Amino acid sequence: AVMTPAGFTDYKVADITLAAWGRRELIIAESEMPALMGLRRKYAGQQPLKGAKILGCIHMTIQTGVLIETLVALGAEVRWSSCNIFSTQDQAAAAIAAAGIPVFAWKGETEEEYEWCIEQTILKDGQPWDANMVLDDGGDLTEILHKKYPQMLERIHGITEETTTGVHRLLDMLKNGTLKVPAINVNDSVTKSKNDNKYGCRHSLNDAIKRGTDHLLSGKQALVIGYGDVGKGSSQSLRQEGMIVKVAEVDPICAMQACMDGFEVVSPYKNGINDGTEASIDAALLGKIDLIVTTTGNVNVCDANMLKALKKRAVVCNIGHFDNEIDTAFMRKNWAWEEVKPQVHKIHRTGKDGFDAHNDDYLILLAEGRLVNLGNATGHPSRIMDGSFANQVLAQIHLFEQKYADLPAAEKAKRLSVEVLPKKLDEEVALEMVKGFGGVVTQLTPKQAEYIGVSVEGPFKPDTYRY
Amino acid sequence: AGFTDYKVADITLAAWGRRELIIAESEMPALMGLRRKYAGQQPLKGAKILGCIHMTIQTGVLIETLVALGAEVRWSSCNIFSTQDQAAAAIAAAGIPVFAWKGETEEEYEWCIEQTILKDGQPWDANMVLDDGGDLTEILHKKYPQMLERIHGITEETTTGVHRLLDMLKNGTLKVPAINVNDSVTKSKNDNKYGCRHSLNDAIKRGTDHLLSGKQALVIGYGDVGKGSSQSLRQEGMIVKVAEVDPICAMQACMDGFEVVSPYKNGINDGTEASIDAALLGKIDLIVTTTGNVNVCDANMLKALKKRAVVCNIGHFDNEIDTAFMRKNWAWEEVKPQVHKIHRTGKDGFDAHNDDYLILLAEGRLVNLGNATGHPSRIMDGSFANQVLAQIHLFEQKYADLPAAEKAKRLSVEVLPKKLDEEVALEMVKGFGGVVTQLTPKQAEYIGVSVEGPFKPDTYRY
Amino acid sequence: AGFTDYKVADITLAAWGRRELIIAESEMPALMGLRRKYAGQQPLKGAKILGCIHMTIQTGVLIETLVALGAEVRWSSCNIFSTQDQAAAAIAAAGIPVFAWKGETEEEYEWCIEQTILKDGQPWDANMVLDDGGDLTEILHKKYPQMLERIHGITEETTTGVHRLLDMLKNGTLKVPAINVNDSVTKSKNDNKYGCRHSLNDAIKRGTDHLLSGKQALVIGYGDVGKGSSQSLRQEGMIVKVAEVDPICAMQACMDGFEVVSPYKNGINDGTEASIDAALLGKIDLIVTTTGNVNVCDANMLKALKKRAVVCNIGHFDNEIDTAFMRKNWAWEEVKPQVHKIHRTGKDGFDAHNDDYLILLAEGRLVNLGNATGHPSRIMDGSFANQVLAQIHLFEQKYADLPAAEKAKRLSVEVLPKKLDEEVALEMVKGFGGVVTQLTPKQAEYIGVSVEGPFKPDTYRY
Amino acid sequence: GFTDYKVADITLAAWGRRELIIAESEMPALMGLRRKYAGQQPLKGAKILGCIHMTIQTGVLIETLVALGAEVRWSSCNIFSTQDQAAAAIAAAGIPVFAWKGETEEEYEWCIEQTILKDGQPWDANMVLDDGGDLTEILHKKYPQMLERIHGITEETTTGVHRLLDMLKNGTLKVPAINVNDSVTKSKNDNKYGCRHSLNDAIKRGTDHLLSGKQALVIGYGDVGKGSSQSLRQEGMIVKVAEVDPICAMQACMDGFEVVSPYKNGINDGTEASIDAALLGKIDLIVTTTGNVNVCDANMLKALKKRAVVCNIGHFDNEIDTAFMRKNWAWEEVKPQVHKIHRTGKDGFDAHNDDYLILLAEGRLVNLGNATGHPSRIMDGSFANQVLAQIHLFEQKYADLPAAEKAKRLSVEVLPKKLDEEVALEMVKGFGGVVTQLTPKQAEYIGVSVEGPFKPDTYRY
Ligand SMILES: NC(=O)c1ccc[n+]([C@@H]2O[C@H](COP(=O)([O-])OP(=O)(O)OC[C@H]3O[C@@H](n4cnc5c(N)ncnc54)[C@H](O)[C@@H]3O)[C@@H](O)[C@H]2O)c1
Ligand SMILES: NC(=O)c1ccc[n+]([C@@H]2O[C@H](COP(=O)([O-])OP(=O)(O)OC[C@H]3O[C@@H](n4cnc5c(N)ncnc54)[C@H](O)[C@@H]3O)[C@@H](O)[C@H]2O)c1
Ligand SMILES: NC(=O)c1ccc[n+]([C@@H]2O[C@H](COP(=O)([O-])OP(=O)(O)OC[C@H]3O[C@@H](n4cnc5c(N)ncnc54)[C@H](O)[C@@H]3O)[C@@H](O)[C@H]2O)c1
Ligand SMILES: NC(=O)c1ccc[n+]([C@@H]2O[C@H](COP(=O)([O-])OP(=O)(O)OC[C@H]3O[C@@H](n4cnc5c(N)ncnc54)[C@H](O)[C@@H]3O)[C@@H](O)[C@H]2O)c1
Ligand SMILES: Nc1ncnc2[nH]cnc12
Ligand SMILES: Nc1ncnc2[nH]cnc12
Question: Binding of substrate: at which residues (chain D)?
Answer without folding.
Answer: 55, 131, 156, 186, 190
